[PDB]
């Protein structure tokens, strides 16, 4: 009967000179801490029990107390940063790393879970877990010919912890550790379990969220085609991180963006740009905005795949944040695109939704839309057709909005709008 003990009784049991009494009290503590209704984590910490749990981690001759104390410590380390810090300050990191090699799979799984929580807290604890030498034994746990012979939950916990070692910025994980972990992530990215795939995609999205050198580390391993395939998954928990990784990658150079395009990503965007999940739509439109900031042949790839009508659609009706990403996409398209491509954009109906967005209460989207209008007018000048575009803008109500913006609080707004009026509506 280790259910519902008081903290005083747990302390009495853990301070007894009786390994079995200590074990029973430790299990009682684990059960307290694993209740979803406000676990008394802080009371356990104040009782001074973390050092006792950490010392129990080292009793190889009593694996049950190793297991129970590991689980109690894991439940503490899954809370606030101060509670994770309490666990770390007790010396738990090297003890859990030593337990990674346990012959009891449940104990090593508990150690994997604990190190995942600790490393997930933040950059400093992540780098400290790495310094204590966790990566080698972690990856050795996965050194089997077929991942499918491992228990499902075990492999899932390993993948989650590895993703947490790839997580957080300022600073990003050490390049050495990233290189050490990447091959295993590449293997996990091909494993048939939705949760393993989701967490591998999350790890990749963490590693690609940075300068082009990190992106390049990831892209050199050849994972972009697999990322696109997973972009096409039906499980939203897979699509979300896969799309995040692809967007990150296209924030890089034009060659990395081209690697995304060559893998077939664009063919998936009709659905992504109409996805019923608002965040999928927003991230797909952000990815598109970065693609249309590339070379003219990449804008042309966007055109060939019939995605300009979907950007018109998103601009016309979507969550306002998605519409802002779409305005960005249009401004980049018009800034980098050929005359023919801007003409095509107009022929797809961009002008009316573009104008309708000028009544928004957001200054940045107004600046972006005015930049797009100026670029389109530049193309029209190059074609000597500013009157046609002026009439088009005037017929859908854009001229009223621009003349109203001429008197806007922001300096840039009234400047750009006055320029447009004087230049093409006089």
Author numbering: 72 to 497
From the primary publication:
Active transport of proteins from the cytoplasm to the nucleus is mediated by a family of nuclear transport receptors known as importins (or karyopherins), together with a number of ancillary proteins including nucleoporins and Ran1–3. Importin α is constructed from an N-terminal importin β-binding (IBB) domain and a C-terminal NLS binding domain featuring ten armadillo (ARM)-repeat motifs. The W proteins of henipaviruses share a common N-terminal domain with P and V proteins, but have a unique NLS bearing C-terminal domain that is recognised preferentially by importins α3 and α4 (KPNA4 and KPNA3), rather than the better characterised importin α1 (KPNA2). In this study, we present high-resolution structures of importin α isoform adaptors bound to the NLS regions of HeV W and NiV W, providing insights into the molecular basis of importin α isoform specificity.
To extend on the structural repertoire of importin α structures, we tested whether these ARM repeats are similar in the structures of importin α isoforms that do not contain bound cargo. Importin α1 and α3, crystallised in P212121 and P1211 space groups, respectively, both contained one chain in the ASU. This is the first report of these adaptors being crystallised without cargo bound in the NLS-binding pockets, although a dimer of importin α1 has been reported previously. Comparison of the cargo-free and W NLS-bound forms of importin α1 showed that the structures were remarkably similar with an r.m.s.d of 0.180 Å across 408 residues, and importantly, the positioning of ARM repeats 7 and 8 remain unchanged. However, the position of ARM repeats 7 and 8 was retained in both the cargo free and bound forms of importin α3. These results suggest that ARMs 7 and 8 do not undergo conformational changes to accommodate binding of the W NLS in either importin α1 or α3. We superimposed importin α1 structures bound to a variety of NLSs including monopartite and bipartite, NLSs within domains including CAP80, and BiMax, and found that in all structures the importin α1 C-terminal ARM repeats 7 and 8 were in the same position. Similarly, superposition of a variety of importin α3 structures confirmed these regions are highly similar in all structures and allow for favourable binding. This supports the notion that the positioning of these ARM regions, highly similar across a wide range of structures, is conducive to high affinity binding of W in importin α3, but not importin α1.
